[PDB]
Structures are given as C-alpha cells and as structure tokens.
Design an enzyme around this catalytic site. Structure first.
Site, PDB file in Angstrom:
ATOM      1  N   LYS C 119       0.853  -1.176   0.000  1.00 53.99           N
ATOM      2  CA  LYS C 119       0.000   0.000   0.000  1.00 53.99           C
ATOM      3  C   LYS C 119       0.896   1.235   0.000  1.00 53.99           C
ATOM      4  CE  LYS C 119      -3.857   1.903   2.791  1.00 53.99           C
ATOM      5  NZ  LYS C 119      -4.705   1.685   3.999  1.00 53.99           N
ATOM      6  N   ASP C 215     -17.002   2.788  10.183  1.00 55.75           N
ATOM      7  CA  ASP C 215     -16.977   2.221   8.839  1.00 55.75           C
ATOM      8  C   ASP C 215     -17.643   0.850   8.787  1.00 55.75           C
ATOM      9  OD1 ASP C 215     -16.534   1.968   6.164  1.00 55.75           O
ATOM     10  OD2 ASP C 215     -14.367   1.669   6.307  1.00 55.75           O
TER      11      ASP C 215
END
Lengths: 338, 48, 264
Positions: C119, C215
RNA sequence: ACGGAAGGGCACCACCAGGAGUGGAGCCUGCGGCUUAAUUUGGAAACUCACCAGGUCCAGACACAAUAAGGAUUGACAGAUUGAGAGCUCUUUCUUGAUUUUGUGGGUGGUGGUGCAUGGCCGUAGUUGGUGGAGUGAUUUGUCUGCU
C-alpha cells in the site's frame, strides 16, 4: 543446476600450423573490432550454448561466492594452498628464513641431496657448464592460484591467444603454462573480465595454477621455437604479482540485435534471438546500448524472429542493441619445462 | 634518494575522487619514511 | 498516476546512495546544490543526477552557476523501495492491481516468493498541478502512513482477527494478502446467524477500548471476518459517540434484509 | 530568489442554499494489466493496418574481365501449378536490336538526422530602454508620502 528451465542465473536486484596462425590472427583481428560478440547460429537453440552463463548488472558491483559446483574446475581446487595476506605471508617466511638458516653465506658446504640414478645421464661436469643449485622456501613447492603480469616484448607484434601454452621463467624455475589473461583493474569483489586475446601494449594480468613464489620475481614469457633461430621466440616479460585464489575471471559473451520499428514501445529484435524459448532465459537480464537505454525485452512472435523490446531512455536509430552473459573461466594446471 | 618499501594508492580529497598510486620510500640518509608520487601515467610498473 | 513502476531498475550503484545523499541533507538543507551530494568521484554524482534529473527523481532549477536541488516526490519512492527490498520483501510487483483512491494495493513478491499486498500512501491520486513540492505529497503522506501503521499493529496486537501490518517505510505499508470477499460485493453465504452474532459482537470488540468503528457499514471486511479501512474510528472521549452506535449497527441491520435476509 | 510568514481579492473547473447526478445492478466504450502467433499505437469483416502466419516476385549505379550480332536480352493470345487476366515458371517460339547480361571490383540513393545552419510563407495597464543627480563600486533616485 538445471533447476529452472526459465531463469538464467541472475540473483535479482608445417603449413597447417601456419594456417592456424592465420586463424589466430583472424580471430584476434575480428575480436579487436567487435569484442566478446558471439554470433549465434540461428539454426541452433541459444539455450544449450548458454546454460552455465550468469547475467549481471555489473561485474564490479555484484558478488559471487568464490567457487561453485563447477565441474569444469580442476578437482585439485581443494588441493591448493589458500593464502591470507600475501605480504603477511612472505615477510613471515623470510623472517623464518633469517632465524633458521644454519648455513651462513660465504661458507663452503658439501651438500647431500636425495637424487635418483635416473637423472645422472643429464649431469655434466661443473667446468664446461654450470650445475648450480638454488634453494627454496617453505611453501614454494606447492600449488596455488597465481597471477603474473604480462607485457609484450619490444619487437613483438604477433597475436597471443589466451590458452595457448607459454613457458614461464619466474625466478629460477621454469614451467609450461597455458594461462588465463585479464586486464588489470581494481574491482572490490576481485572479479575481472576475461580476455580472449592480448592487448597491443597496456599491461595485463595472466593467471594460472603453479606453485608459489614468495619473493615476487621477475618473469620472462616465451614459447619454445625449436624449428626457428635461437631456441626461443620470446613473447613477453612480467612480474609475479601474488598468489590469489579469489581472482575470478569472467568470460563475457555479447548477444547482439537490431531494431526494426521505432516509436512504439521502443524497439524490436532481428539478430539477437531466434526462438520464444530465448525469452525466458534472457529477459530478466538487462540490456545495454552504446549511449542508450536499459533492460527488459518482452515477448512476441519468434516464429520468424522478432522480439518486441522495452527500454528506458530516448534515442534510437539505425543502431545496434546488445546484451551480455558472464561465465567464470577456470585455471588450468601446469607442468615444468626441461 | 631512497628505497621503495611498497606501492600504494590514494583516496584523495573531493571533488576529484580516485586512486592516485603513490609509493612508500624510506630515505637512505635519514632512515625517514616518506610517501612519494610517481609521475606520468603508467610508471608504477617501472618501479618495484 | 503519480506513481511509476518503470524506471526502478535502471539506476546504478551510487544512485541509491546519491539519491540518498540529498535525503540526509534534506531534513536540514531542504535546498541541496550539487557538491552537497559529494561528501555524504567526478564521474559519480551527476551521472546519478543525469538519471535523477532526467528520470525525475530530483527536480532541477536552471542557472549559469551551480544549481540547488530539492528532492522529488518520485525520488523517495525508490529510496523507500530500496530499504523495502533491504529489510526484506518486494522482489517484484504483481499483475493484479489493486488501484484504489488514496492508496495503491499492490500484489508484491516478498522473499520466499510470497505474493502480498503493498500500500503506497499518498492522497488525491491522479501528481497534482496545485501542490507545493517537497512536503504535501511526501511529508504529509509520509507521517500519516505510520499514524495508521502503528494503529493496526496496536489493534492487531489486541487479538481481534484483522490484517497484520508486515512492513512500513516512507509512506509505504505492506501487509497480508488477506483473501476473502467483501460484503459490499457479497454474492452468497448460507449461515448468517453466528456470522452476524459475531458481527454485532464484533462491534463490542471494536468497542472493547471505548471506541466505535463508524466504517462498519458495507464495503468493509471479508469472509475469512477480514476487515479493512480502519482509520475513521471514534473515542469514548469523542463527544457524539452515542449517535454513531445506531448508525453503524442499523446500516448493517439494513443490508442483510435486502441481500441475505436476516434481522436481529 | 526564497513551495517561506501574514494580509488582501477573484472563481459553480470552489463553498453556502439547493438542483440534477456518478460511484451500488447490468451492459457499451476507453486506459492499464493478463492471455494470445499478434491483441498496431500514446465509427478495423478486405482496404485502413503501422501487427501476426505462410507464400510468390524484385533489387544490383558505375569501373573491369568474359560472353554476346554464328543471339545478350524485352514483351508475347492457352493450359498446368500456385490462393489470382503470375510468361514466377513451363510444354513452346513470335519479336526485339546491345537499350543489355555471368563474375570480380566497384556507387549511388535516402520525404535519413539538423527550423538547434540560411531564406520566404502560414497561424496567432503594463513594458521599458534615454538624459540626468548620488556612490570609486556592486547599486540607486526615476518606478513617489499625503488629498479627491
């Protein structure tokens, strides 16, 4: 091993001899102009030829573990004396030679040498010739990998190939040596580029297996010329450098291609390869050009010949494209010359 | 005048970073040991 | 867009260290002329810069006199991937991306040949015309990687089943492949009852520190749960926390009714 | 000069108020990647096509040797072969007039590189330098505080 049918080793980051002489002059003549550029037969697969070769970014930067499971080395490789610092060898040995010399110089000695009756028939009387006897040192009998430093003779201009036999007189002893030539450079990994022939002037380095000198004697290099004038055609002179086993000579073979059509990715291939089998071996290995770009040909057809390459940089024209593969060379053992 | 002890090489000041191939002389008349430069290129192979 | 996989390989020995040479000075001297690289031969540094200036790892200002440089967003990228490869990881990039909004999921090959996820952290992915160089893309995105990186490592150390961060250097965080499928795309599963019994209790897990996920709605986690996009969480000190409780739960009270037909 | 301070303005490629939306479903298209003989490259069934697989055909200036007016060589209405109004070839034979042919040596040609060698053509309220004066000089005043 042959483990991996892809992935070449990378670690990713009287008149017939004169016709042989014209062959040596031709191979050195062309080997001057396009050096190390092997010319592939397109009929034959470039895989079997290049099985043992290992591709490198740069000779100077990479590291080999010293030997390998070789089997074109001499098996007497382990039957070699390994040396540390050669300076810290020979000053120690001369130091022991001072401290343990029973015979001070200028002393008359009757000498008792173990000697065969085989060899009395070459003895002459010490008047019309010079039977003279030279001492040796501790390990000056036993084999290790040495290095000389050749340079050509003044008149001499004939080409010298890299493993033709040359008699070497370093100090007193004289051996018959088929050498290994390399140019003198100072890489930190001690890995240097093999020479197939020898330069016109700039002093190179030979390498072979011979027993050690501990004094760095000067050396004259010649081949015997028995048919000729005086019994020797002298080739060169030089100096025993040191005894290095780790002096790794790398045989360079350059595969060369042409581009066809530009501006698209960069470039394709004409003469470099033949089959799409040639992809998988040689296309993790980068590629150079003559003030240009780097790396990574990618696959295409091979059915006629063409391998659509990728690169990094700008300029491309009616030019060439060349990659490389490197292989260690191995020393050959030597014999005396009498 | 002096006896050469060994052949060396340098890693000199910036910007010119190189190996310049000096030697070690021991002088005769003092026994002092002073480093020395060999001139025009080549010529390290002339001395021993 | 801003990132590039092309030129990583073709730099030479001194380059990585020369490209490093501007970085050590960067923290103090954020404008670096040419000789300031030397100390840290006369071939070495500009043939690196010839790369770095023409390969865009170092920006160039043109003047008759010697020119001051300041290291480029592109240049840290490989410097990262230099120490990345040097811890150990990232033998090669993978063919499955992995292109997200603010972060780059990269199938990437660790030593042993481990396909794993890289990432890259930098925001607003397109290089943007509106940025001041040296800080916003580097340094904002630089710190914030570790901000997240040591949360998951701290949150995985809790013991809840989640991804474990593998490596982080210079706005690049690498972690497990974490195969599974998100519920955002969920296709079929038979057994919700303990699935959601885990889920609603997975919440008090998320709440075991006095936190709330926010989330936890769809597009987060996969059938192993495999959960992602952590950063939005709210403290017990965080004032409005109680409103977000029924937000999270009921939105996943919402989902199941449509797709997989369950109710608490 | 400083991606450095702070301060002023502008803007549905910004925000407020909303409005219609995308992103969620399917499908079309474009980019990357993957695969593939190749998926040309940063409104494609032939053509386009620059890519792939086989296939025929052609090249060769000019200097020289030889041959060739007791044929060097051009083209020639079928049929076979080849995917084809291919005399490529061939079963042949009408004609050519050195225009050329085999071999050696041997050279021209590039819309090849340079607008980064020269012309010409086409498209499309702030800058400054002067004379001052000051300072040996870098430099400066000019290019400016206040009122409308």
């Amino acid at each position: 091993e042959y483990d991996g049918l892809t992935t070449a080793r990378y670690d990713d980051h009287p008149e017939e001899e004169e016709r042989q002489l014209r062959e040596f002059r031709d191979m050195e003549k062309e080997d001057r102009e396009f050096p190390d550029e092997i010319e592939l037969e397109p009929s034959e697969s470039a895989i079997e030829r290049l099985k043992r070769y290992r591709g490198l970014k740069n000779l100077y930067n990479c590291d080999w573990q010293v030997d390998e499971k070789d089997p074109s080395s001499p098996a007497e490789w382990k039957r070699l004396l390994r040396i540390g610092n050669y300076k810290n060898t020979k000053n120690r040995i001369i130091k022991e030679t001072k401290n343990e010399a029973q015979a001070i110089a200028g002393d008359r000695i009757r000498m008792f040498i173990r000697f065969p009756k085989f060899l009395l028939e070459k003895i002459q009387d010490p008047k019309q010739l010079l039977f003279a006897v030279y001492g040796l040192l501790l390990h000056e009998h036993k084999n290790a990998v040495v290095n000389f430093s050749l340079q050509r003779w003044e008149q001499y201009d004939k080409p010298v190939p890299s493993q033709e036999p040359i008699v070497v007189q370093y100090g007193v002893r004289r051996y018959t040596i088929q050498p290994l030539f390399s140019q003198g450079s100072n890489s930190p990994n001690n890995v240097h580029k093999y020479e197939r022939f020898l330069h016109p002037d700039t002093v190179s380095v030979a390498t072979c297996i011979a027993p050690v000198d501990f004094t760095q004697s000067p050396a004259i290099f010649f081949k015997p010329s028995p048919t000729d004038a005086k019994n020797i055609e002298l080739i060169g002179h030089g100096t025993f450098l040191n005894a290095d086993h780790s002096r790794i000579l790398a045989k360079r073979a350059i595969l060369t291609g042409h581009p066809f059509r530009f501006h698209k990715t960069v470039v394709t291939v004409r003469y470099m390869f033949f089959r799409p089998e040639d992809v998988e071996w040689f296309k993790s290995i980068p590629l150079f050009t003559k003030s240009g770009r780097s790396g990574f040909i990618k696959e295409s057809l091979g059915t006629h010949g063409y391998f659509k390459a990728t690169f990094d940089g700008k300029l491309s024209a009616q030019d060439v494209v060349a990659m490389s593969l490197y292989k260690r060379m191995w020393p050959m053992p030597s014999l005396p010359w009498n | 005048k002096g006896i050469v002890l060994e052949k060396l090489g340098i890693e000199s000041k910036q910007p010119n970073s190189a190996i310049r191939k000096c030697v070690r002389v021991q002088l005769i008349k003092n026994g002092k040991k002073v480093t020395a430069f060999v001139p025009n290129d080549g010529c390290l192979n002339f001395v021993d | 867009m801003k990132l590039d996989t092309s030129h990583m390989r073709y730099l030479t020995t001194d380059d990585f260290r020369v490209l490093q040479a501007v970085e050590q000075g960067s923290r103090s001297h954020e404008v670096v002329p040419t000789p300031l690289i030397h100390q840290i031969s006369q071939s070495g540094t500009n043939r690196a810069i010839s790369d770095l200036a023409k390969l865009s790892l170092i920006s160039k200002m043109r003047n008759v006199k010697y020119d001051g440089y300041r290291l480029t967003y592109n240049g840290i990228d490989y410097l990262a991937l230099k120490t990345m490869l040097n811890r150990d990881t990232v033998y090669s990039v993978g063919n499955t991306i992995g292109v997200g909004k603010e972060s780059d999921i990269y199938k990437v090959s660790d030593k042993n040949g481990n396909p794993r996820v890289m990432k890259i952290h930098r925001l607003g992915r397109t290089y943007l015309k509106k940025s001041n160089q040296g800080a916003n893309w580097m340094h904002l995105s630089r710190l914030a990687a570790n901000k997240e990186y040591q949360f998951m490592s701290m949150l995985y150390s809790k013991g809840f089943k989640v991804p474990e961060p593998f490596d982080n250097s210079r706005h690049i965080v690498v972690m497990e492949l974490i195969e599974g499928y998100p519920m955002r795309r969920l296709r079929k599963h038979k057994n919700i009852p303990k699935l959601y019994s885990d889920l609603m209790c997975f919440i008090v897990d998320l709440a075991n520190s006095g936190l709330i996920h926010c989330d936890f709605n769809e597009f987060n986690i996969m059938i192993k749960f495999v959960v992602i996009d952590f950063p939005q969480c709210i403290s017990i000190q965080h004032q409005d926390a109680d409103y977000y409780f029924q937000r999270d739960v009921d939105c996943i009270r919402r989902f199941f009714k449509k797709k997989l037909k369950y109710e608490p």
